[PDB]
Amino acid sequence: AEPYIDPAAQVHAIASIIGDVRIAAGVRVAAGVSIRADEGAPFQVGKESILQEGAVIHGLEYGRVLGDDQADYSVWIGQRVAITHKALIHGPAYLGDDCFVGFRSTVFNARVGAGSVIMMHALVQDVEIPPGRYVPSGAIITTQQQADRLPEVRPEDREFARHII
Amino acid sequence: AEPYIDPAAQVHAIASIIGDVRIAAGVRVAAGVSIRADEGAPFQVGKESILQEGAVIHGLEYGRVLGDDQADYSVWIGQRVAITHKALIHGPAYLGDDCFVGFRSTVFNARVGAGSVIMMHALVQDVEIPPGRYVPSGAIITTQQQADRLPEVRPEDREFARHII
Amino acid sequence: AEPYIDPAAQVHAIASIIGDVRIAAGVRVAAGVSIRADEGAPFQVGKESILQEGAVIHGLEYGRVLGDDQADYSVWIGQRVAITHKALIHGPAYLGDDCFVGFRSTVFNARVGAGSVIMMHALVQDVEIPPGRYVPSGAIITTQQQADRLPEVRPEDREFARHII
Amino acid sequence: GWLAPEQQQRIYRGN
Amino acid sequence: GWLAPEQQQRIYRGN
Amino acid sequence: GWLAPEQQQRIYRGN
Ligand SMILES: [Cl-]
Ligand code: NI
Ligand code: NI
Ligand code: NI
């Protein structure tokens, strides 16, 4: 009913975290981030994840994903996930460890495998993205055929991601 | 000069409604919604409409649409219209009854016929969308030829919409 | 370390300007605008520029553009630049005088020549746009080949821009 | 406005 | 939901 | 940065 905020998390005073949200050690949450597990709950934000300004995490009343701990979440964000400016993560949603979600991108009703890089102005909806795939800027990914076809993440993509965080 | 808020509306304490805005019975307005009829005015939000977080309703100083009541509005939102996360409705704008505007979608200088479903990450600008049309995710609808060509809404589309509200 | 705000600027009480930001005479900043030179700094907003609601100006810790004054900025916004609803300007970024950035558009790691018109729902990343080019609605401009190919701004485009400001 | 009058009329009123 | 059950299962759990 | 130096220079300075 109230958020669990790890004493080692750095949550900006002006961030809004509401409801059954677990924020792990080393998570950074910028000003003007909204995390509301007031409809869909619970949410998990894994260790050393980063949420930038304008990021929203919300969830549908119904529909869940299976967490790494074998519990059900509206939203599971793994470790060292980067949710950048103006990204929307809408449950049901799974982001595996080391994922990057670029500016103004959306993940809704989707599972994104670890080590995937979603670029800027993209939509990921209704799909499982396999681990380690790249979603180009402006992509609209709404079918499993499209998600199974995505190219692999290259080292240049992760270096790009590390620069932006 | 000040908003008329129906006693049966549910407006979040942190929503910002400014200027000549009429909010009808049963309208729900989330936290972090901005409705400013401070340039373009007036705005009408019809019965049992829903505005989700990040939604903005603004309007140009000049340019109007004809309301169902035969009065001129910067923004006319009909009954049971769903304006979802991060949608922008910019006057001049008409949304007919039972319309759905998906995540991060924009309606600007446009008339959207009743019972239309606008999906996620779409733009609707400078057009009349006939009643009961579907605008796919990622569509950029900026010409009347494009708007006259849109496919019809199917029952699966409205069921999708009801799930998201 | 603190913003320089020209006494002739009109900054809304609810706008958030943080860090090494210079706001020139006649700049208008709407409510719910965020300018944070807390990572990448400094920022310059030139005379009679307009920032509308939802606009964000941020910058990477590293990477700069050369200002007209021959100093280095994370973000240089020239004179009479229009940064409209929900636009993201992310340093390193240069916007030349008289540029227009339409609703929900992004400029990141890019130089936009004076008198350019960026329309709605567009991305401009990693490029130099020559002076006086038009970026259509929904464009994803991420390569120099694409930016060198853009069409010229016509008078109808600037008239459109003046209407929206 | 910026559109042809007959097109602005489809937005103002509709067919 | 709105998807085929086997597709909602790829999102719930993954292969 | 992530770009070729001559391309980052077009962004830093322009032609
Ligand atoms: Cl947005
Ligand atoms: Ni929601
Ligand atoms: Ni406006
Ligand atoms: Ni940033």
Author numbering:
A (entry chain A), B (entry chain A), C (entry chain A): 16 to 180
D (entry chain B), E (entry chain B), F (entry chain B): 256 to 270
Q: From the publication, what sentences describe this entry?
A:
β-Carboxysome biogenesis is reliant on the protein CcmM as a central organizing scaffold. The γCAL domains mediate M58 trimer formation.
To identify the C2 binding site on γCAL, we analyzed the γCAL198–C217 complex by X-ray crystallography. We also solved the structure of γCAL181 in complex with the C217 peptide of CcaA at a resolution of 1.63 Å. The asymmetric unit of the crystal contained the protomer of γCAL181 with one peptide bound. This indicates that all binding sites of the trimeric γCAL181 are occupied by peptide, providing the basis for multivalent network formation between M58 and CcaA. The peptide is bound as a two-turn α-helix (residues PEQQQRIY) in a pocket beneath the protruding β10-β11 loop, making extensive interactions with residues in β11, β17, the β19-β20 loop and α1 of the γCAL protomer. The hydrophobic interactions include π-stacking between the indole ring of residue W257 in the C2 peptide with the benzene ring of F123 (β17) in γCAL. In addition, the hydrophobic residue Y267 of C2 contacts the γCAL residue L81 (β11). Two electrostatic interactions (salt bridges) are formed by the guanidinium group of the peptide residue R265 with E143 (β20) and D163 (α1) of γCAL.
